[PDB]
Design a protein around this ligand. Structure first.
Ligand SMILES: Nc1ncnc2c1ncn2[C@H]1C[C@H](O)[C@@H](COP(=O)(O)NP(=O)(O)OP(=O)(O)O)O1
Ligand SMILES: [Mg+2]
Ligand SMILES: [Mg+2]
Length: 427
DNA sequence: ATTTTGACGCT
DNA sequence: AGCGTCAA
């Protein structure tokens, strides 16, 4: 009772851009706005591969990883924007730069953890304390939460905005605004700040986003997706038993792969809430000490992973697949594509050094061989001493060249090349 | 022929 | 170090 931790110490938000690459292209090209639209990479093979889909297009069944030719069968009027191609490969610079726009706005409000190209976690605990001091017991108006859903409410009129407002009203009517240590009040103030953040993002970039507000990263991430697009969702500690009672295990971040499948198989359960019926030692016995403790706390809504102070990526990488009959089968091919990758990498590294006062010191070279189901077949490192594309490509070849069984020829043919600059030091 | 990334874990 | 997992 009085010594049971409840995981209510922090206010954490997750902000994730809505159909991000599509919005970047729609800002640039007004003809694409408010249309069924997708972003594709490459075009020769089946029209290209879709990597982002507007919500209008999702209504037709268009999804990521679909070939555009196949998406056009579902949505004949689908509009397409193509990823830039430079040096023979897709180049994501436009979206990285748009990401920086958004991350720099968010960083004005609080320390952020860049979690992907289009999302960041925010630790709002201190900002909420400050705002609560400023508010001096004044109640929080629903007008301050115009796009917020309270998960689990209303409980106890047939249109969606009416439901949202009814739930928000029940929540606010129940708040105890005279207790500055109240976790529910802290989350509510967090949601007010996130409304302000999302308004600033939209005003200053044109991009819309969704957000989750809760007490930790996992719940914030889960909350964000509950009411996408262009809305934010507050998941309180008290909402967790009902929310988790029908929540498939695979929906929780880090449980969407083999571990989550093993939880389901070994324990014979389906939903996150069912995990509460195992001891911490039972869970550690099946899934290891770290995983077992994490699962024991997480199924009760408790997680302690900190929002890390890091808004810049830790690595800068360049990769290209060579599928099917395009797999590289000659030495000259391997060297030419290593040079293309190294030239893009040099451009990005030079910009990074100027912008961010740091230098990479290690070059990682990865390759996939034809037939291997693993993303990487072989990874080798060497020193990155000069931002020089010819030197980087020559070193990468030196480091991988003895994987060739025999040849001028390369066997088995290479289905992927990957260069990654790592181990940054201040400069 | 689901591509191009990027973080973190294990041994 | 090099390989594996999970993820957007
Ligand atoms: N598997 C993949 N391969 C390549 N790029 C990918 C990708 N998954 C995502 N991207 C790129 C393209 C995506 O636009 C961007 C952000 O990914 P999301 O946040 O998962 N999806 P979005 O923002 O589009 O939609 P919403 O969040 O509203 O559901 O990252
Ligand atoms: Mg997104
Ligand atoms: Mg995302």
């Amino acid at each position: 009772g009085p010594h049971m931790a409840t995981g209510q110490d922090r206010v954490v938000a997750l902000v994730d851009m809505d159909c991000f690459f599509v919005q970047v292209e729609q800002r640039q090209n007004p003809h694409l706005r408010n249309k069924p639209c997708a972003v594709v990479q490459y075009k020769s093979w089946k029209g290209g591969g879709i990597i982002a889909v507007s919500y209008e297009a999702r209504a037709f069944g268009v999804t990521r990883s679909m070939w555009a030719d196949d998406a056009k069968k579902l949505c004949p009027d689908l509009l397409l924007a193509q990823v830039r191609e430079s040096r023979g490969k897709a180049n994501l610079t436009k979206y990285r730069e748009a990401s920086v726009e958004v991350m720099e706005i968010m960083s004005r409000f609080a320390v952020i953890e860049r979690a992907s190209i289009d999302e960041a976690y925010v630790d709002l605990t201190s900002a909420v304390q400050e705002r609560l001091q400023k508010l001096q017991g004044q109640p929080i108006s629903a007008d301050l939460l115009p796009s917020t859903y309270i998960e689990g409410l209303p409980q106890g009129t047939v249109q969606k905005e009416g439901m949202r407002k009814q739930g928000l009203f029940q929540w606010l009517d129940s708040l105890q605004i005279d207790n500055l240590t109240s976790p529910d009040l802290q989350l509510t103030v967090g949601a007010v700040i996130v409304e302000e953040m999302r308004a600033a993002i939209e005003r200053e970039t044109g991009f819309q986003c969704s957000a989750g507000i809760s007490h930790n990263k996992v719940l914030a991430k889960l909350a964000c997706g509950l009411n996408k697009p262009n809305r934010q969702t507050l998941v309180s500690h008290g909402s967790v038993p009902q929310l988790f009672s029908q929540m498939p295990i695979r929906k929780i971040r880090s449980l969407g792969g083999k571990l989550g499948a093993s939880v389901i198989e070994i324990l014979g359960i389906e939903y996150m809430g069912e995990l509460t019926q195992f001891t911490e030692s039972q869970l550690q016995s099946h899934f290891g000490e770290k995983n077992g403790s994490w699962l024991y706390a997480m199924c009760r809504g408790i997680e302690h992973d900190p929002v890390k102070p890091r808004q810049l990526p830790k690595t800068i990488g360049c990769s290209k697949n060579f599928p099917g009959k395009t797999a590289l089968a000659t030495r000259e091919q391997v060297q030419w594509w290593l040079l293309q990758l190294a030239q893009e990498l040099e451009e990005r590294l030079t910009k990074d050094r100027n912008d961010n006062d740091r230098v990479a010191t290690q070059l990682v070279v990865s390759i996939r061989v034809q037939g291997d189901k693993r993303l990487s077949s072989l990874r080798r490192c060497c020193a990155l001493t000069r931002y020089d594309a010819h030197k980087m490509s020559h070193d990468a070849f030196t480091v991988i060249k003895n994987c060739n069984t025999s040849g001028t020829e390369w066997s088995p043919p290479l289905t992927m090349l990957f260069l990654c600059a790592t181990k940054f030091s201040a400069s």
